[PDB]
Amino acid sequence: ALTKAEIAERLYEELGLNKREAKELVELFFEEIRQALEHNEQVKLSGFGNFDLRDKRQRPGRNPKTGEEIPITARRVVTFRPGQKLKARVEAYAGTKS
């Protein structure tokens, strides 16, 4: 996978900023994004998809391997909407399903 260690490496390589502080830079950006959504502060991005929080309603659930049914409680969960610029970048590649 792509890893924030690999971001720290890329940031050293391409910008030249030392990896020690680069790792803290990425992890702080990755922490403040969490702080925003944790506060229910919708995070809104352009040139990139963005971060919404959806209040899901009561839904039927199951044990898929037994067929037992369990209710799914209403909940607020984060939902990220890819943008058309990102979709256009991602639409086609390689030759196998993902």
Place this chain on the structure above:
DNA sequence: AAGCTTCCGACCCTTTTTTCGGACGATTTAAAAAACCCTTATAAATCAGCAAGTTACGAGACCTCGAAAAAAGAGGGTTTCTGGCGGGAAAAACTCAAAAAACGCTTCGAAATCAACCGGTTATAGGTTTTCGGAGCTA
């Protein structure tokens, strides 16, 4: 013959060196004064241990003044440590702008989903061991 300049003699005054005289000290010599010796039988001192009464010399204490040593106070200076202010460069906010990029309209039909539980994936927090950089060092 006259004027200028330079020696020379006469003198005036004070300081520096030498000589002489006088005074004082020290030593020597002589003269004067105090003292020593020789005659004494009789009177007074010698002394033995201890008691009873007294004190001349020593010790303790304090004062007094003066001086000496130490401590403090003063002044001269140099070295350095810090603070304030001023100046140039970089950063980042501030101002100005375009071009994307998102959002909405607006989706009926296609995913997304959660739930519990198994096995499996793997990013990486954390720790462990080690090159690179710099310490300067030395002429």
